[PDB]
Scaffold this motif. Structure first.
Motif, PDB file in Angstrom:
ATOM      1  N   UNK A  26      50.024  -8.230  50.461  1.00 24.53           N
ATOM      2  CA  UNK A  26      50.790  -9.362  50.963  1.00 24.53           C
ATOM      3  C   UNK A  26      50.229  -9.780  52.312  1.00 24.53           C
ATOM      4  N   UNK A  27      49.941 -11.070  52.454  1.00 24.46           N
ATOM      5  CA  UNK A  27      49.390 -11.634  53.676  1.00 24.46           C
ATOM      6  C   UNK A  27      50.270 -12.782  54.141  1.00 24.46           C
ATOM      7  N   UNK A  49      47.305 -12.561  57.569  1.00 22.37           N
ATOM      8  CA  UNK A  49      47.526 -11.290  58.240  1.00 22.37           C
ATOM      9  C   UNK A  49      48.196 -10.328  57.268  1.00 22.37           C
ATOM     10  N   UNK A  50      47.519  -9.225  56.965  1.00 24.40           N
ATOM     11  CA  UNK A  50      48.073  -8.229  56.060  1.00 24.40           C
ATOM     12  C   UNK A  50      49.360  -7.654  56.637  1.00 24.40           C
ATOM     13  N   UNK A  51      50.415  -7.627  55.821  1.00 22.41           N
ATOM     14  CA  UNK A  51      51.720  -7.146  56.256  1.00 22.41           C
ATOM     15  C   UNK A  51      52.324  -6.130  55.301  1.00 22.41           C
ATOM     16  N   UNK A  52      51.738  -5.916  54.140  1.00 17.42           N
ATOM     17  CA  UNK A  52      52.232  -4.920  53.216  1.00 17.42           C
ATOM     18  C   UNK A  52      51.781  -5.232  51.805  1.00 17.42           C
ATOM     19  N   UNK A  53      52.288  -4.434  50.870  1.00 16.64           N
ATOM     20  CA  UNK A  53      51.994  -4.594  49.454  1.00 16.64           C
ATOM     21  C   UNK A  53      53.298  -4.646  48.678  1.00 16.64           C
TER      22      UNK A  53
ATOM     23  N   UNK C  19      60.034  -5.207  60.262  1.00 15.23           N
ATOM     24  CA  UNK C  19      58.681  -5.596  60.644  1.00 15.23           C
ATOM     25  C   UNK C  19      58.701  -6.488  61.877  1.00 15.23           C
ATOM     26  N   UNK C  40      47.281  -7.895  65.090  1.00 15.43           N
ATOM     27  CA  UNK C  40      46.985  -7.028  63.956  1.00 15.43           C
ATOM     28  C   UNK C  40      47.529  -5.623  64.188  1.00 15.43           C
ATOM     29  N   UNK C  43      51.596  -5.116  63.881  1.00 12.88           N
ATOM     30  CA  UNK C  43      52.248  -5.111  62.575  1.00 12.88           C
ATOM     31  C   UNK C  43      52.116  -3.728  61.953  1.00 12.88           C
ATOM     32  N   UNK C  44      53.244  -3.163  61.524  1.00 10.93           N
ATOM     33  CA  UNK C  44      53.276  -1.876  60.830  1.00 10.93           C
ATOM     34  C   UNK C  44      53.364  -2.169  59.338  1.00 10.93           C
ATOM     35  N   UNK C  45      52.241  -2.003  58.639  1.00 10.46           N
ATOM     36  CA  UNK C  45      52.177  -2.411  57.241  1.00 10.46           C
ATOM     37  C   UNK C  45      52.970  -1.475  56.338  1.00 10.46           C
ATOM     38  N   UNK C  48      56.910  -2.487  54.832  1.00 12.33           N
ATOM     39  CA  UNK C  48      57.178  -3.188  53.582  1.00 12.33           C
ATOM     40  C   UNK C  48      56.643  -2.401  52.395  1.00 12.33           C
ATOM     41  N   UNK C  49      55.432  -1.852  52.514  1.00 15.86           N
ATOM     42  CA  UNK C  49      54.835  -1.132  51.394  1.00 15.86           C
ATOM     43  C   UNK C  49      55.686   0.066  50.992  1.00 15.86           C
TER      44      UNK C  49
END
Ligand SMILES: [Zn+2]
Ligand SMILES: [Zn+2]
Ligand SMILES: [Zn+2]
Lengths: 98, 48, 49, 49, 49, 64, 44, 242
Positions: A26-27, A49-53, C19, C40, C43-45, C48-49
Motif C-alpha cells: 500500500x502506497x 510512500x509505502x505505508x503497509x500491506x 500511523x 520515510x 512512517x511505521x509500516x 497497518x501490515x
C-alpha cells in the motif's frame, strides 16, 4: 520479497505452500509543506510512500487470479471451481464471517 | 495449634523442588517456575 | 451485516490513526530538536501490515 | 431389520461392495516443521541424528 | 430372499438407490486407550504421550 | 475420480463402459438408451454410469 | 538427494548444507523425489 | 542404575515414561521421563528494525537475524556510546550481507534516519566487537535487485550479470566498488537491449553518481562484445553503443 530482497508476484498457492500472507503493498502520495515565517513556502511531495500491506481477498479485483480464464487458473494450480472470497494469512485460508 | 504471633511472617517457608520444578525449555535452559522467580526476588530483598 | 469490507474499514481507520499519530510523535521529536524530519523514516509500516 | 445389527440408528454395509471401493476414501495428514536459528547457542538443522 | 438360508422373507423389503455420505468421523480417529501411561512430572497425574 | 472397475452391488465390470457410454451419448442416445446398449440391465449397474463424475479429466489439466 | 522444482520440475541433486533452490529456475519450492525403495501393495 | 547392573545404560520408554535396564527389564523410575514434554511427536529498537525491514519488504528471517545481532551487541556493550538507531541499522546491514542478499550502505541510509558515515562506523564497530566476519560482496549479489527495481527483462539481467562477472575476472575495473561495476554493466546491457535506460535512472536505482557510472563504463567500454553472452538477442547492435 526474497531473502536477497528481489520482489516477485506472489501466487496464492505459493502463499499456501510457503505459509505466506497474501498481501498487497500500500502506497500513499504525501505532500509536505513547510513554512519558516520567512515569506517562503516549500512544498515537497513524496509520491507513492509505502505505508503497509493490505491482505487481499482471493479472486477479487486486486487478486492476481482476477479475470484469469479457467485454463489460466489450472496453469497456476488453482481450482477453477474455487470461489475465492477468503484471505491467506500465514498460509491459512481465513474467511471473514459476516 | 494457632497463635496470633504466628500470623506474622517472621520466617518464610520455601516450597520443595517437587512443589515448584525446574522446567526444561529450548534445550538445557532450565525454566524456573514462577515461585522461584518470586523466591529469587524475596531472597535478594531479604539480603539487602 | 458487516461484511469483509466494512469490517476491514473498521480496522484500517484505527490502524491509520495510529500511523498518523506515530508520524506526529516522530516528527515532534525532531522538530523540537530543531532539525527537519525524514518522512520515510517517520512512517511505521508495521502498524497497518 | 435383517439381523439386529442396524438397530438404534446403526447400518449394515455390504462387505463385497466395500471390497470393490464402495465409500473408500483417502486421508491426507500434512505435517509442517521449520528450523529456527534464533539464539546464538542453539541452531537446529534438518538431518538424521 | 434370506442370504443365510435362501428362503423368501415374508415381508417385502423397501429397496432402492439412495444417496449416502461418508462422514469425517471414523472410529480409528476416535478409539483410544490408557493403561499406566505417561503421568505429568509436576502433578504426577495422567497426560498424553 | 475415475470410473470404478466393478459395479459395487454385483461386481459386474463397468470400467470398460465409460468411454463407450460417452460415445453413445455423443451419438444422440438418451442416457437410458445408452445404458441398454451397453448391457447394463440391473439398475445397480446403471447407477454406476448414470451417477459417475469423471474428475480424472480435470485433474489432468494440472501439469505434473 | 534429488529435489524436483515446483515451477519447472527440474531434478537437481542438492546437498544438506547448500541452500535449497532450483539451479536454473530459481524457484524456492522443492519436492523430494519418490523413494527408490520398494513398497508392496495388496490390491485389496 | 539397575541395582543388579551397575553402570547400565537405561533405555527410555515412551509407553509410560520410564527408564528400563537395557538387559534386565527392571523399570528404574516409575514414570519420570515425561515423554510428552521431551519428544516432539532494549525496546523501541526491534520495532525500529521491523520498520526498516518493512520499508525494504525484506523477509522475516533477516529481521530475526538482525534482532539476534542487536541483542548480542547490546550484551557486549563495546559501542554503548553509539545511538541505538545506528546500531540497529548496522545490524540490519550485517544480517542482509550475511544471508546472501547484501544491500548497499545507501540502501540502508535511505531507510534509516542516519547518514552512511555512521552506518559504516557502526558496522565496523560491530564486526570488531562481535569478533565475526562477513564474506566480501560480489558484483552478482546486487544484480537481481537492481534489475528487478528496473523494468529490465530477465534476459537483460542475465546479460548484465555475465558482463559484470567477466569484467571483474578480466580485471577491467581494478579497485572499483562492485556497485559501480554493476551499474555500468546494467547500463550497457540496457543500451544494447531493446529496453534502454539512461545513466540517471541507473544511478538512482543503484545509488551511484552518473560520473562514477561513466568512469566505470569507460574502463570496460572497449571490451563490450566479449563480455556479452555468446547467445544474446538484441535489436540495437552491441557493435555500436554510446
Ligand atoms: Zn450391478
Ligand atoms: Zn525450476
Ligand atoms: Zn538389570
Amino acid at each position: 520479497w526474497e531473502r536477497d530482497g528481489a520482489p516477485s508476484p506472489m501466487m496464492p498457492n505459493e502463499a499456501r505452500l510457503r505459509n505466506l500472507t497474501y498481501s498487497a503493498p500500500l502506497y500513499v502520495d504525501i505532500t509536505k509543506t513547510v513554512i519558516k515565517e520567512g515569506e517562503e513556502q516549500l512544498q515537497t511531495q513524496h509520491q507513492k510512500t509505502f505505508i503497509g500491506k493490505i491482505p487481499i481477498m482471493l479472486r477479487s479485483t486486486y487478486c492476481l487470479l482476477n479475470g484469469l480464464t479457467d485454463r489460466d487458473l489450472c496453469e497456476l494450480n488453482e481450482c477453477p471451481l474455487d470461489p475465492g472470497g477468503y484471505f491467506i494469512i500465514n498460509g491459512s485460508e481465513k474467511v471473514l464471517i459476516a | 495449634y494457632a497463635r496470633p504471633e504466628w500470623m506474622i511472617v517472621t520466617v518464610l517457608p520455601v516450597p520443595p523442588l517437587s512443589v515448584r520444578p525446574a522446567v526444561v525449555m529450548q534445550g538445557s535452559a532450565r525454566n524456573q517456575d514462577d515461585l522461584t522467580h518470586k523466591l529469587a526476588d524475596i531472597v535478594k530483598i531479604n539480603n539487602q | 451485516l458487516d461484511l469483509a469490507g466494512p469490517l476491514l474499514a473498521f480496522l484500517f481507520r484505527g490502524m491509520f490513526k495510529n500511523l498518523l499519530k506515530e508520524v506526529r510523535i516522530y516528527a515532534q521529536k525532531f522538530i523540537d530538536r530543531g532539525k527537519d524530519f525524514n518522512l520515510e523514516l517517520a512512517i511505521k509500516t508495521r502498524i497497518i501490515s | 431389520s435383517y439381523t439386529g445389527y442396524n438397530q438404534e440408528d446403526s447400518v449394515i454395509m455390504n462387505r463385497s461392495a466395500v471390497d470393490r471401493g464402495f465409500f473408500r476414501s483417502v486421508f491426507y495428514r500434512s505435517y509442517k516443521e521449520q528450523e529456527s536459528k534464533k539464539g546464538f547457542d542453539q541452531e537446529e538443522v534438518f538431518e538424521k541424528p | 430372499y434370506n442370504g443365510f438360508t435362501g428362503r423368501k422373507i415374508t415381508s417385502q423389503i423397501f429397496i432402492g438407490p439412495t444417496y449416502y455420505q461418508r462422514l469425517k468421523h471414523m472410529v480409528d480417529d476416535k478409539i483410544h486407550s490408557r493403561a499406566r501411561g505417561p503421568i505429568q512430572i509436576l502433578n504426577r497425574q495422567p497426560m498424553e504421550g | 475420480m475415475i470410473i470404478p472397475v466393478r459395479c459395487f452391488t454385483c461386481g459386474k465390470i463397468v470400467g470398460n463402459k465409460w468411454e463407450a457410454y460417452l460415445g453413445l451419448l455423443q451419438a444422440e442416445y438418451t442416457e437410458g438408451d445408452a445404458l441398454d446398449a451397453l448391457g447394463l440391465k440391473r439398475y445397480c449397474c446403471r447407477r454406476m454410469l448414470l451417477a459417475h463424475v469423471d474428475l480424472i479429466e480435470k485433474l489432468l489439466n494440472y501439469a505434473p | 538427494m534429488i529435489y524436483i522444482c515446483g515451477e519447472c520440475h527440474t531434478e537437481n541433486e542438492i546437498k544438506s548444507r547448500d541452500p535449497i533452490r532450483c539451479r536454473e529456475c530459481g524457484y524456492r519450492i522443492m519436492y523430494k523425489k519418490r523413494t527408490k525403495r520398494l513398497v508392496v501393495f495388496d490390491a485389496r | 542404575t539397575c541395582p543388579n547392573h551397575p553402570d547400565a545404560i537405561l533405555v527410555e520408554d515412551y509407553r509410560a515414561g520410564d527408564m528400563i535396564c537395557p538387559e534386565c527389564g527392571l523399570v528404574v523410575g516409575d514414570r519420570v521421563i515425561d515423554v510428552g514434554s521431551e519428544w516432539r511427536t532494549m525496546m523501541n529498537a526491534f520495532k525500529e528494525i521491523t520498520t526498516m525491514a518493512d520499508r525494504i519488504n525484506l523477509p522475516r528471517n533477516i529481521v530475526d537475524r538482525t534482532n539476534n545481532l542487536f541483542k548480542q551487541v547490546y550484551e557486549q556493550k563495546s559501542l554503548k556510546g553509539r545511538a541505538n538507531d545506528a546500531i540497529a541499522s548496522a545490524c540490519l546491514y550485517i544480517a542482509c550481507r550475511q544471508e546472501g542478499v547484501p544491500r548497499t550502505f545507501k540502501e540502508i541510509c535511505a531507510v534509516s534516519r542516519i547518514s552512511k558515515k555512521e552506518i559504516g562506523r557502526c558496522f565496523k564497530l560491530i564486526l570488531k566487537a562481535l569478533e565475526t566476519s562477513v564474506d566480501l560482496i560480489t558484483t552478482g549479489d546486487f544484480m537481481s535487485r537492481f534489475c528487478s527495481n528496473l523494468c529490465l527483462p530477465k534476459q537483460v539481467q542475465m546479460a548484465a550479470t555475465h558482463i559484470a562477472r567477466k569484467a571483474v575476472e578480466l580485471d577491467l575495473v581494478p579497485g572499483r566498488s562492485p556497485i559501480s561495476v554493476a551499474a555500468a554493466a546494467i547500463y550497457m546491457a540496457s543500451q544494447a537491449s531493446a529496453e534502454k535506460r539512461t545513466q540517471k535512472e541507473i544511478g538512482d536505482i543503484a545509488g551511484v553518481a552518473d560520473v562514477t557510472i561513466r568512469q566505470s563504463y569507460r574502463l570496460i567500454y572497449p571490451r563490450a562484445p566479449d563480455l556479452f553472452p555468446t547467445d544474446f538477442k538484441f535489436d540495437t547492435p552491441v557493435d555500436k553503443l554510446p
